[PDB]
DNA sequence: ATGAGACGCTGGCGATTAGCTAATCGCCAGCGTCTCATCTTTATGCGCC
C-alpha cells in the first residue's frame, strides 16, 4: 500500500500484529492485486437474510 | 545543393453532495327518519289422473 493516524475507520491497516490500528493508527490505501468475482449470501436488514449477492471482491497485495 | 522524426498521478481515500423506497402498524371508514303505494314469496291448513 501507501507508506504514509488514529482513526475510526476500517480501510486502516494493522502496522504490526497486535497493533490495533482503531488505538495506534496504520496504513491507509490497500493497492488491489487483482479483482475477484464472488457469488455467495451474506446477511441483509435487521432480520440478517442471506440473499444471494454477486460482487467484486478486492485481493490487495498483501492478502 | 536540409533540416523532421521521440508529448502528464492516478487511484485511493475522504468527504462532500445528492436522494429514496420500503416495512409496520394503526385508523377508520355518511347516516338519520318517515310517508305512500306496489308486488311477490314463505310456515301451516284441501283435491288422483
Redesign the pocket.
Known sequence: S?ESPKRN???LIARKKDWDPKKYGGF?????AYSVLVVAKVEKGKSKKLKSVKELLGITIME
Not at 491507509?28 to 488491489?32: A, L
Open positions: 501507501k475507520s476500517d480501510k491507509d490505501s490497500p493497492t488491489v
